[PDB]
């Protein structure tokens, strides 16, 4: 899914992290498609929350393995509880983060 890698990201910002780009390509070679690429709006908002918690909370900075993987598990926990990305608060994201950590 190399063609889909760059063109879709431009459309997110209406334009006319390289490790994150390689992780999406791992999903194409594994599951055939990319569940993250289609719902990138919810990922970017959650990745911006996971980013802030790693740099402003000791329990995250000293107990984290992969920022991308932690964002995915958090989005799967919110989808399981059927909670939306727009109506989610950064403080609420932190409480779920420490649990998985």
């Amino acid at each position: 899914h190399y063609g889909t890698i760059i063109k879709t990201l431009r459309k997110y910002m209406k334009l006319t992290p390289s490790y994150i780009l390689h992780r999406i390509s791992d999903e194409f070679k594994e599951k055939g498609y990319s569940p993250t690429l289609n719902d990138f709006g919810k990922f970017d908002k959650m990745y911006s929350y996971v980013n802030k918690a790693y740099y402003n909370d000791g329990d995250i900075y000293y107990s984290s393995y992969d920022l991308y993987d932690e964002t995915i598990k958090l989005l799967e926990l919110l989808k399981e509880s059927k909670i939306n990305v727009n109506d989610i608060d950064y403080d609420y994201v932190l409480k779920l983060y420490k649990q998985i950590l």
Binding site: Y55, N56, D57, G58, I60, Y61, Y62
Partner: protein, 128 residues
């Protein structure tokens, strides 16, 4: 050049350079923890620093405790990233085979250094 500090725990003194020229200030412990032989713990220091951009905070063990009671740090050259604004914690570990280590509140467990790191840009090449 200065460096900002926020005492999340006012009960512990401000870190002090003491004698000028020494590598770094020593950090105090905010918790009372006892390390069994082999075990480890993440002690909170009760302070938060704002390392300047383009530099790095480094947490080194103290030679006193390491030689005598055998107390060291798991991630021994402890990294404090420039963008980190949280409470600095130290991952101590009792390396003594069969002697418990007791850390009281206020005991200086490790020291903090600040050095200029070369923020490089990786470039892949076919063959050197």
């Amino acid at each position: 050049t200065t460096l900002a500090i926020v005492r999340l725990d006012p009960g512990l003194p401000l870190p002090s350079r003491a004698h000028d020229g020494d590598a770094g200030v020593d950090l105090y412990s905010a918790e009372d923890v006892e390390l069994a032989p082999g075990r480890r713990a993440l002690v909170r220091t009760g302070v938060a620093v704002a390392v300047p951009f383009g530099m790095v905070g480094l947490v080194h063990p103290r030679s006193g405790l390491a030689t005598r009671v055998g107390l060291s740090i798991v991630n021994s050259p402890g990294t404090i990233d420039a963008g980190y604004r949280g409470e600095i914690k130290v991952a101590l570990i009792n390396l003594d085979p069969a002697a418990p280590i007791v850390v009281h509140r206020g005991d200086r467990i490790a020291q903090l250094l600040v050095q200029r790191v070369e923020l490089v840009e990786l470039v892949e090449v076919s063959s050197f």
